[PDB]
């Protein structure tokens, strides 16, 4: 119930202590005899019964594993757990948190119970406690800086993730942006989504021809197709019609061109809408939009027999 006064043990008068040992100090009498004076700091630290004073005395002296034997209230268990994490003792932290109903925390701590480097362990502990900046700094100073990326992407702080990826993982810059662009498609923001999709294009990997290279090539191709699809759709969303229509016509996916064809009427660019409606896979709705909005009978004359 205090945080500024040190605890004090009143030595009996006329004593000159000479040696502290096991929490007790031998003080020399004026006659030369040695008498043992016990410190109240080490009071009951060899007791394994549910006594609060013994737990606090062990807790203050960093007897954390020993103090795990003596716990009286769940709040004291919480204090011991947070201090054990604070002292970078994950092996004791798992044992304490097994009795605090946090199975996810225990399972994630069991993945890091074997690491010993203090920078990396410090970063993991800071991430667990919720200090993201300190965790990022510790991970960057450690031997595995890529963790500093993984915390950002899992928290989807895409700006910081892309900032880190510019020097850590040059090949991860597109993918991190791409998901960002998808998230941008949820927010109604498409202007920067164009840049994100454009930077999402991945250069073709080259190397020894095998199944692994072929699979990586196919994944790169699929990522490029998704990026160009998103870029064209966002271009149609904002008003960049002519640039997007070339990419729309180059592809062959019916659903993609169907989704792209809807927004062309709103920007009064009805020529590209007319071109896309007939190849959208349906002719009835295309002719309905023709006779109601476009009023271009020359194109509908070809669709009359169908």
């Amino acid at each position: 119930d205090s945080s500024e006064d040190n605890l004090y043990t009143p030595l009996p008068p006329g004593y000159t202590p000479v040696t502290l040992f096991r929490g007790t100090v031998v003080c020399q009498t004026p006659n030369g005899t040695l008498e043992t004076v016990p410190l109240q700091t080490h009071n009951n630290i060899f007791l394994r019964t549910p006594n609060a004073e013994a737990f606090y005395n062990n807790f203050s002296l960093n007897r954390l594993r020993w103090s795990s034997n003596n716990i009286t209230s769940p709040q004291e268990a919480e204090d011991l757990a947070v201090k054990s994490l604070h002292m970078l003792d994950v092996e004791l932290a798992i044992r304490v948190y097994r009795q605090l109903s946090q199975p996810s925390l225990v399972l994630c701590l069991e993945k890091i119970r074997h690491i010993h480097e203090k920078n990396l362990l410090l970063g993991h502990v800071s991430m667990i406690m919720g200090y993201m900046k300190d965790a990022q700094n510790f991970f960057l100073r450690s031997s595995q800086p890529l963790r500093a990326l993984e915390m950002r992407r899992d928290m989807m702080q895409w700006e910081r993730a892309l900032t880190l990826a510019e020097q850590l993982a040059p090949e991860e810059v597109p993918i991190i942006s791409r998901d960002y662009a998808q998230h941008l498609e949820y927010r109604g923001v498409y202007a920067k989504a164009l840049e994100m999709y454009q930077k999402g294009l991945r250069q073709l990997p080259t190397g020894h021809a095998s199944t692994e290279l072929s699979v990586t090539v196919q994944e790169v191709e699929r990522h490029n197709e998704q990026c160009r699809q998103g870029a064209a759709r966002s271009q149609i969303r904002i008003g960049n019609i002519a640039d997007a229509m070339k990419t729309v016509k180059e592809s062959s996916e019916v659903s993609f061109v169907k989704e792209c064809a809807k927004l062309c009427e709103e920007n009064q660019k009805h020529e590209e809408a007319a071109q896309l409606y007939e190849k959208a896979g349906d002719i009835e709705r295309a002719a309905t939009i023709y006779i109601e909005r476009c009023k271009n009978l020359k194109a509908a004359e070809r669709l009359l027999p169908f």
Binding site: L88, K111, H114, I115, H116, E117, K118, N119, L121, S143, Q144, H208, A209, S210, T211, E212, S214, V215, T216, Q218
Partner: protein, 357 residues
């Protein structure tokens, strides 16, 4: 023996489940030799599909990557078994072998995520103590200043403080007899290996043995896009170093040294050499299509062998000496001349004999 029973009758699903459970049990119980054995066999089986099913290419690539990950885990656990035994047990040990094992673990522990129950503190303490004992004083103080930045058990800090304060004396000079040598660069590895156990001048991972982890006179390379494996040996049989220019493409100043550049050979190089000068390693992940790796043999006075169940490199005399332990290859427990039927009846006979007593 139920795992061997499953593997005898193919059945990849239950064999996978059993082998993964056994590997996890060995890792959680710190049975590092058992964990290495289970993980290398898991990597071996990860390309054993059912005959009725034709796997897709994406699944093939994913299982190839998982097999390589399991191979790396098995290598790390097998290396770490002896170091953990030395650190935590008062057991007899070799000094130079443990020193080279510690160097290999330091090299290959920073490359990727370290596997569970492989600690940096224990391996750093082992390397520091052995280097101090073997008078690798410069190496000892380097690994001690690295050891300052890890966590040690509660009954180790005082001793490590005393050791690192005492090691700051003595001349800073390491012995030239117990330093790793890179045959690719023809230079001694005076500095500690980086992440992945790579030469400072060439970035190529050295080909150590796998019982005492001493380097071997082999150089790793991969063929180009227009070569196979069968014809190479026969061409060499039918009938100064061509890679030196490639060497000039590695350690030359101004060249990109961010990532390791493999040596590349074509059909012109694979000719006019000695028959045994080339070692062909076919990584055994089962039926998965994986290109073979090749190794040039620099010297002939050292005998190197490959286990047919692992294709790892061992010193032939040391491999023969280790094979007498009653298991075979220390990593694989592989014994040649074994039939599945005879070994499958052996467990039944052993069950009969055990039930008798």
């Amino acid at each position: 023996e139920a795992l061997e029973a499953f593997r005898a009758a193919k059945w990849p699903k239950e064999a996978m489940r059993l082998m993964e459970t056994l590997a996890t049990n060995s890792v959680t119980c710190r049975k590092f030799r058992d964990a290495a054995f289970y993980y290398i066999h898991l990597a071996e089986e990860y390309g054993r599909f059912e005959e009725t099913e034709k796997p897709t290419d994406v699944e093939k690539a994913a299982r190839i990557r998982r097999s390589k990950e399991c191979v790396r885990r098995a290598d790390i656990y097998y290396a770490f078994s002896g170091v953990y035994a030395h650190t935590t047990q008062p057991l007899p040990y070799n000094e130079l072998s443990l020193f080279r094992t510690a160097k290999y673990l330091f090299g290959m522990c920073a490359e990727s995520a370290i596997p569970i129950n492989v600690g940096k503190g224990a391996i750093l303490y082992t390397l520091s103590r052995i280097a101090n004992r073997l008078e690798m004083v410069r190496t000892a103080r380097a690994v001690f200043e690295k050891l300052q930045g890890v966590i040690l058990p509660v009954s180790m800090m005082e001793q490590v403080d005393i050791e690192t304060l005492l090691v700051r004396s003595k001349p800073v000079k390491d012995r030239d007899e117990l330093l790793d040598r890179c045959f690719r660069c023809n230079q001694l590895i005076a500095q500690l290996p980086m992440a992945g156990d790579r030469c400072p001048n060439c970035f190529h991972p050295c080909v150590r043995s796998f019982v005492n982890f001493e380097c071997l006179p082999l150089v790793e390379f991969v063929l180009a896009d227009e070569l196979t494996d069968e014809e190479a040996e026969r061409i060499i049989v039918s009938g100064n170093d061509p890679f030196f220019t490639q060497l000039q493409y590695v350690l030359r100043p101004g060249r990109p040294t961010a990532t390791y550049q493999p040596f590349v050979a074509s059909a012109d190089i694979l000719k006019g050499f000695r028959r045994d000068e080339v070692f062909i390693v076919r990584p055994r992940y089962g039926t998965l299509p994986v290109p073979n790796r090749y190794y040039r043999l620099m010297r002939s006075d050292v005998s190197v062998c490959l286990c047919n169940g692992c294709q790892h490199f061992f010193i032939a005399e040391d491999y023969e000496a280790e094979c007498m332990r009653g298991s075979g290859c220390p990593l694989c427990r592989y014994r040649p001349g074994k039939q599945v039927s005879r070994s499958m009846k052996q467990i039944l006979f052993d069950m009969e004999t055990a039930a008798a007593a």
